[PDB]
D-ribulose-5-phosphate 3-epimerase, putative
Amino acid sequence: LKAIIAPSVLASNISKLAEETQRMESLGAEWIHLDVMDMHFVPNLSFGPPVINNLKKYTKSIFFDVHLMVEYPEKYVPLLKTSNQLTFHFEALNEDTERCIQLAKEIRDNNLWCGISIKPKTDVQKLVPILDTNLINTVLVMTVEPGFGGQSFMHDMMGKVSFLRKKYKNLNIQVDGGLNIETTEISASHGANIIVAGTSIFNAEDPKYVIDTMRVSVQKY
Ligand SMILES: [Zn+2]
């Protein structure tokens, strides 16, 4: 397990996506978190494969972490072959294990990391059957109602994080929604090792300071 900081571009000046990502890259961010929303799974439309595929032309080593907050996530796999991890929602596939296992198999067969996400009201234990197959590289625990940035961190989601870390020691646990210096420390104390932060990084007075502070706090655990 590694301490990973993944700035969420949704909170940046997206009309300058390439510039913002290169900046995060120059500051040492290991991953770049790309939120794809289709105005159906969530009430917001962000950007899709055409934008992400073009961005890849201007980046270097930064890992492409795509969070698919969309219906029919299976349709996006062939459109994002140059990315690094594709994370789909357990809820997008009607919470049925077999369908999730099949999509995960396909994503892994495209030589991509596979992530699965659950919203605040979804019970973490429902993921066990899928997680036991070892096909999932990352579980993205939403710490806020997905769709928009700027919302407040839900401390009551930490139980999900502890459950996962205790049961799966090598599983990457990602938190997303309201992460800042203080809530990153809280998340890491429960087992999170990948931190998605939007507002706290892109609106920071000293971006690198925030990123480094966050990483060290995760590494401590
Ligand atoms: Zn996300």
